[PDB]
Amino acid sequence: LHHSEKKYAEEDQVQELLKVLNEISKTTLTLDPRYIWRSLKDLSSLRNQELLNAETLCFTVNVLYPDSSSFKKNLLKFITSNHKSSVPGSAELRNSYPASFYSVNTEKKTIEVTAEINCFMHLLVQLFLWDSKELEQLVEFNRKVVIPNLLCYYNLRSLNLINAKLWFYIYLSHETLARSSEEINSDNQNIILRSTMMKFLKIASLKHDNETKAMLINLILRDFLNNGEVDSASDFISKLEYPHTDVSSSLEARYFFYLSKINAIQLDYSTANEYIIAAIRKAPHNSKSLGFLQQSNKLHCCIQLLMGDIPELSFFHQSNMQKSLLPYYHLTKAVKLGDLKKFTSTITKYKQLLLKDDTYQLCVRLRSNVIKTGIRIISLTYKKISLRDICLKLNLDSEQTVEYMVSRAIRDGVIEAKINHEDGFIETTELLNIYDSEDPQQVFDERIKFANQLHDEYLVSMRYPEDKKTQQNEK
Amino acid sequence: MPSLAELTKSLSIAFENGDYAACEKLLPPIKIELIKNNLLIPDLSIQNDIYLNDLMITKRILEVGALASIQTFNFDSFENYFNQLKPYYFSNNHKLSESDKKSKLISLYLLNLLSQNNTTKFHSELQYLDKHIKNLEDDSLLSYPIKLDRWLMEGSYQKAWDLLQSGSQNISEFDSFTDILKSAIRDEIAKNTELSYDFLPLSNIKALLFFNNEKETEKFALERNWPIVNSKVYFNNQSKEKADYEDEMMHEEDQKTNIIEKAMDYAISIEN
Amino acid sequence: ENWDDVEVDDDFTNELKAELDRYKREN
Amino acid sequence: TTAAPLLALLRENQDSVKTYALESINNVVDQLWSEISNELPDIEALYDDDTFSDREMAALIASKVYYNLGEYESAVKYALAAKDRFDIDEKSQFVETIVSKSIEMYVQEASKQYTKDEQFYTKDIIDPKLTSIFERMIEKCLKASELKLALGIAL
Amino acid sequence: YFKLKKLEKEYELLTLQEDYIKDEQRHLKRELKRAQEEV
To answer: What are the C-alpha distances in Å from A321 to residues A97, A294, A311, A318, B59?
Structure first.
């Protein structure tokens, strides 16, 4: 019973291992194993639950263990090990074959098979930890191991794609430990985590790995927003080390999401409004990306309201996620009509929901945008309007108060009007008739290069596959 | 003004007796003994020393040290004590005795940023605070920098002037940054009617910037270079030019044609 | 799709226009 | 620990206190360099100061800033400014790149000045900042019993 | 030691083919002039 369960999963694990084993040996095929490793994460997670945990026990006995003897026992110690044929050396699948890692040449240390075996061993360990939700001592123990091992080994172009997915598990397992319980050991542990990211980033820049730098930057930018340090994030994004070529669309959408929140508090929403749009377009529409689409859609509505523009209501209607968008719908109506009591009562009841995503601090700026938008509505519809006519609509304080609020928006060119104190009425200074001016021409010259932007990123991609197509023999 | 052998008690006694210039003379010997034992700044590792040795009395050294530099109107020193207090009120978990102790000392740095019209560092420290819903909003103290940012963005300058006057906390700690930031309020409201609004009035602008005397109004016009005519004051500076060199931006002349001509040679260079 | 469907108005229903018939005879 | 306030305190008196201030900075030079870089001009200004005797330790701080900034040419100048703290035998990705960068710029000047004089390697024709690391790297390769990198760079 | 020798040997192909693709465009322009004569 238990014997047939251990040999079935290990045969499938070696079958998937031998595929990427022969591809990295000859020249550089590394683009091919990258596609296999995408499905390896999903195929291993479903396989971990079946055949209990014993698939990883016999796999270590098969190959040679540099560090991995005590790590399995320590992993099996927390679960109250049940020992069945647990003596090392019970299952031997090698039997002296070249693809089986021939034992005599391996045990005599005349050849080194550890490079591809050890780096692949750490990948399967991190998968069971996140699947079984094992925390506390097992999180810190594995962090003290993998990090020193990566500094000793020299990662080639193919080897840099191994640990690239291991950096995600180091940061994820640490954040789940901090949110579960807070202590003095959690703050000091994050200090080393921030120090290790800066040392390996320089090494990854020399190898010019696209997936490695894409995974690091996404994890590094998130740490900056947790501590709230702009000076660290501002200088980091100025280098532009993030390759846009071979990175996946899921890694791109996460990159544009960070830039929207950085420029939001910098009071420049012109560039931030495009970053939140690019994050949605690059993110897939499937169910696994709903976690990113839920947060990105909530940030888009916050960016618009801070610009003075009001987003469309169909976004809160035709979508299927509107159940979570209900708190942001009441903020849409309160800004339009300019009601002061409606905005104060809206953020009071939903304050509990706004604390989770930390968007309640951005709602403080919305208190000013309620009046700024109401002035824009009445100024565009009414060209020449008196001074006291505004205070009778929005129920403002006095005539001197509204005079200062109108002169505030003309700084950035929002209202585009003038205040005449002698005559005592505000007149709109926009006569339109800009068709004869050169202002539309500035956008025209930019849209000429926008069409050519997709031209240089495309024609190259046609010949990209054609090499291996024409090199293979055709019938 | 040294008093006892301990540099902490000698600084506290000289703090209440005045002469803040002599209090900085004892600053160099403070860092001499602390850095050797690494007691000046909390170490990121675990030295088994948190509330012991001089780490308990060091928080009181830089507390009155920042209060000494704010009275001397030193912006270079005030930013130094704040960065030295950055690791403090952070480590030692969430609890020592009073935890953050006085929370208005940190807000002094937030209030000084609004006088320089810097929104980058002002809103950056809002997320740096541990309690967003307690020591920031629910806290009745430190309300000058936070609430003023709401009234300035709202556009009401009448209630913004009452925060620096009607408040009871501006007597001692916030007194130094009151009149300094008051000059920043009048400079911002004056620029609202300056660039866009063309012909400036006489008696009205006195009430916008809160001027008590009419002669103070003319003194502000000489520093801002306002053209003066008979019984009126105009503004001729609406047009902007020069400002170092600008290429391919803001209404070029000869280079504007080359921008369109470059787009034609762009597609040709790709085929090349 | 903006300021259209659910927000509506909550005026211009009855009482506002019902008075307008009296204004024609008051001139 | 934090180097941000310490770099702004270097404009005061008591240079002996500045020695203890630079000791705690050398830990965060590879960490907070993205932050304290605003105070970087104050570090370079002290190097030309005749009353500033800490330039030996101050050269190590600036050498790790401009390098991580993306300027490889500057990392060679600030490393050899002191001619003391710089350790070529230390194995790190910071030193190996500065060595390779100094050799790359040394080959460009070697193929030119060779026409005028063949003795330039024994003379001052080349600024010793180019030949300082170039000479120490060859001696390091000879002690490692590796003739591939020693003879290849020599050519 | 072959990595050092074969390193500079590959730049000869990058040097020729850099200006060789430009010669094909100049030849393409000559073929367009001949195409107008064919009409």
So the answer is: 56, 8, 16, 9, 50
